[PDB]
Amino acid sequence: KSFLTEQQIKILRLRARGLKQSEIAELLGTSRANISILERRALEKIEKARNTITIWEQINSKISVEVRKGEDIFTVPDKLFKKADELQIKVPYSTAEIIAFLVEHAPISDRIAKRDFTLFLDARDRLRISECLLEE
Amino acid sequence: KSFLTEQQIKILRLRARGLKQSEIAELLGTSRANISILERRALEKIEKARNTITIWEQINSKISVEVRKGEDIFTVPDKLFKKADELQIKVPYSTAEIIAFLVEHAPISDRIAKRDFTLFLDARDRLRISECLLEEFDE
């Protein structure tokens, strides 16, 4: 059991096969507007689900450090490394790997944060980003 | 933002710091039963979210093959391998790697499946298992 209805999974699957919203509406015998709304609602539930798994894996993080809007991306690896020594736990990434990770996934605008976010280490030692700032 | 309330996030965090459900009930000033019911509902929503992402990546899967209750786990690599050549795409896993995956994750009872499930290849080329059989959705 999931957060998607059977109807939403069917529409998403038919979309994945390349069918237009108007084509799918005819197969299911409902308005094209209803199909568009149903697809939009499903994608929103998937994003909501994706953020939920992010908050769960963040709650169980080895080490997490917070980056504020406007900070420099290159100052971040030290923040993580300093807190990692405070907890005496190893961060299995070079300063460059952390940066190349932040370029691909962080809300940045050329080395500057455009929003607050937290960078953390997965329980599986993956690097991850979340936009929920948890107080501690 | 997500499917978790601010209350459920606080409780999960306190559990992750090792507290007992009764300790948490005191901190939030409510019954221990309420804390357990809120914690159970939160983990259930996380599993529900985890299954929603699986179905999403299954809908966009490279290659998928379906296995029914009673089939032999050892016949599965051939089904996947034949279906990958019909689509002319590579599966970066040996027959043994596929087997050792199904032993760890599939609903099997000694090399025989106790329920239907779908084995598929992630968009990131990971191996994955899902229990929703969506190949009927093809006409």
Residue numbers in the entry:
A (entry chain B): 4 to 139
B (entry chain A): 4 to 142
What does the report in the manuscript say about this coordinate set?
Thermococcus onnurineus NA1, a hyperthermophilic carboxydotrophic archaeon, produces H2 through CO oxidation catalyzed by proteins encoded in a carbon monoxide dehydrogenase (CODH) gene cluster. TON_1525 with a DNA-binding helix-turn-helix (HTH) motif is a putative repressor regulating the transcriptional expression of the codh gene cluster. Monomeric TON_1525 adopts a novel ‘eighth note’ symbol-like fold (referred to as ‘eighth note’ fold regulator, EnfR), and the dimerization mode of EnfR is unique in that it has no resemblance to structures in the Protein Data Bank.
We determined the 2.8 Å resolution crystal structure of the wild-type TON_1525. The structures of the two monomers are virtually identical; their structures are superposed with the root mean square (r.m.s.) deviation of 0.490 Å for all Cα atoms. Monomeric structure of TON_1525 resembles an ‘eighth note (♩)’ symbol in that it can be divided into three parts: a flag, a straight stem and a note-head (hereafter referred to as ‘eighth note’ fold regulator, EnfR). The dimerization of EnfR is mediated mainly by the flag and stem helices with a contact area of ∼2300 Å2, covering one-third of the molecular surface of a monomer. The long stem helices from two monomers form antiparallel X-shaped cross interactions. In the dimeric structure, two α2-turn-α3 HTH motifs are ∼35.8 Å apart from each other (using the Cα of Glu42 as a reference point). In the wild-type dimer, the side chain hydroxyl group of Thr55 in a monomer is hydrogen-bonded to the backbone –NH group of Phe6 in another monomer, which directs the N-6 region to extend out of the main body. Two benzyl side chains of Phe6 in the N-6 regions of two monomers form π–π stacking interaction to stabilize the observed conformation of the N-6 region.
